[PDB]
Symmetry: C2
């Protein structure tokens, strides 16, 4: 059983959080999910209250760390030195992911220096100005780090976790509980291809790096 930590903060976007949490909860034999924050409770943009299971520092203990999003929440988090200093992430030993403006955090931690990433389309120009090499793609994989852009790209991000840790059967089991009735095959084509295309781009970039190193 893998340990998954979801990193939370005040004014997180409700739909991203609940969808992320719901997808991960669609399997009961894969992972244990803990909500990590800086306070006993955090509030969403709509004022929903979520209790934390532990401190942000506990990302150190996780097999998977996921950063959620928030229009006002993310900029506030970036300005919080204790939040940022707790997030000591190690891609050699952890899968690390983000949704929407969550990639701002991964960028500002230095985890994607010289690498590609994505975010929600409305946030792209700002992330570019912060030095992000932002692509107009739903999922961008760089080794054991993946960033996802636009809320529904959570299907790709969680599917990537399932593919990396388990297999396609697990992936399908999870996604099938959220997808539209009668469209299982349409969404399987979409999800499998989107993830595979992201892996293909990554392996190209890795190959170039190896070529350059040699």
């Amino acid at each position: 059983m893998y340990k998954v930590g979801i990193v939370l903060f005040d004014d997180f976007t409700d739909v991203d959080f609940f969808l992320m949490n719901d997808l991960l909860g669609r399997t009961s034999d894969s992972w244990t999910v803990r909500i990590l924050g800086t306070k006993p409770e955090h509030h969403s943009q709509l004022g929903m209250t979520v209790k934390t299971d532990g401190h942000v520092s506990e990302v150190k203990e996780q097999d998977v760390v996921l950063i959620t999003s928030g229009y006002r929440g993310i900029p506030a988090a970036l300005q919080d030195e204790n939040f940022m200093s707790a997030l000591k992430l190690d891609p050699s030993r952890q899968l690390i992911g983000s949704i929407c403006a969550g990639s701002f955090v991964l960028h500002e931690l230095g985890l994607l220096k010289g690498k590609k990433l994505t975010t929600n389309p409305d946030a792209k120009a700002v992330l570019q100005g912060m030095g992000g090499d932002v692509q107009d793609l739903p999922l961008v994989i760089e080794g054991n780090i993946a960033t996802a852009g636009g809320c529904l790209s959570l299907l790709y991000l969680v599917g990537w976790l399932a593919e990396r840790l388990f297999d396609s059967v697990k992936r399908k089991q999870i996604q099938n509980q959220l997808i539209p009735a009668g469209q299982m095959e349409i969404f399987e084509t979409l999800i499998s291809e989107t993830i595979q295309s992201a892996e293909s781009a990554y392996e190209y970039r890795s190959a170039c790096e190896s070529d350059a190193e040699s």
Copy 2:
């Protein structure tokens, strides 16, 4: 400005509710949304607290009435006589919709007698046993009533509202804020065609009815 009422109850499914609410909130000049319930607050399956804006009886006042979903929540609601008796809906004067097991409510109100509907795949067998003529389709339109099955079919249900009340420009404006970065055209094709196919099936059924009436 149209009046939209979302009908809520305890143990509603978080992801369906927050996604429905988020989509409707993506336009600020279309409609005013009110949460209608039987109590000052309702709790989700995960224990999130949502304040009601008014009583379920106020569905009478709405231009659009939407029933949300819940695995334990819906069966409880069906057994609540005061909840069910408040829901006096009129398809001649209101658009009426549901997501996932929300269609159980519309069925049990008698609104879809001799008509087609959908629900989430895992709920189909039960709805069939209640007398529902359930199809394996994401969106089923019967005049001014539409049922949607599987969480993400909310894209179709809200898009149908936008098409019926406004136009495609409005629809696209709403959906583009949730869809995956770089996949605007893929999702436009998917959403536009899914809604148009549902309207086509409805107009066929209407034509048959007219033929039979003549």
